[PDB]
Amino acid sequence: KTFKQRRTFEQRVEDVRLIREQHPTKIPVIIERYKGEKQLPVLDKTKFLVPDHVNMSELIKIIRRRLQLNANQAFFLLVNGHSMVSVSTPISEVYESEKDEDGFLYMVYASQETF
Numbered sequence: 001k002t003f004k005q006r007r008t009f010e011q012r013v014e015d016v017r018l019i020r021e022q023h024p025t026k027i028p029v030i031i032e033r034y035k036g037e038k039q040l041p042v043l044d045k046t047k048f049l050v051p052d053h054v055n056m057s058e059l060i061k062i063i064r065r066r067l068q069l070n071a072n073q074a075f076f077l078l079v080n081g082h083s084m085v086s087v088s089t090p091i092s093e094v095y096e097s098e099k100d101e102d103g104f105l106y107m108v109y110a111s112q113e114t115f
């Protein structure tokens with residue numbers, strides 16, 4: 001079901017290495033629905049190439065547009081398990097500190113802060 005489950009550490013590492021070669025200015029982001037989630041829909045896809053100049057606040061807006069949410073639906077975006085200290089951080093900076101050893105940046109979303 002989950003991304004890490006579907007691909008070998010070997011395969012995830014090699015995909016990231018190719019995204020580096022073919023999409024050198026993009027951050028490779030896995031975005032997954034919380035296994036508990038009941039309200040929000042599932043994304044059309046799992047793997048995202050996010051432009052490296054956008055801050056986390058702009059990535060939250062991109063995904064809420066991808067989910068086609070309305071303004072009073074709730075949406076939380078956990079990076080690397082935990083809450084973000086700050087949505088003003090550039091995703092280039094968040095990548096360099098929160099990236100997995102496979103080189104993806106993992107995120108989960110829910111309607112509740114209590115995931």
Ligand SMILES: Oc1cc(O)n2ccnc2n1
Pocket residue numbers: 060075076077078079082083084085087
């Ligand atoms: O939409 C939001 C708002 C937040 O404060 N966070 C913190 C981590 N992920 C978030 N997503």
Ligand SMILES: [Cl-]
Pocket residue numbers: 022023024025026
């Ligand atoms: Cl590029």
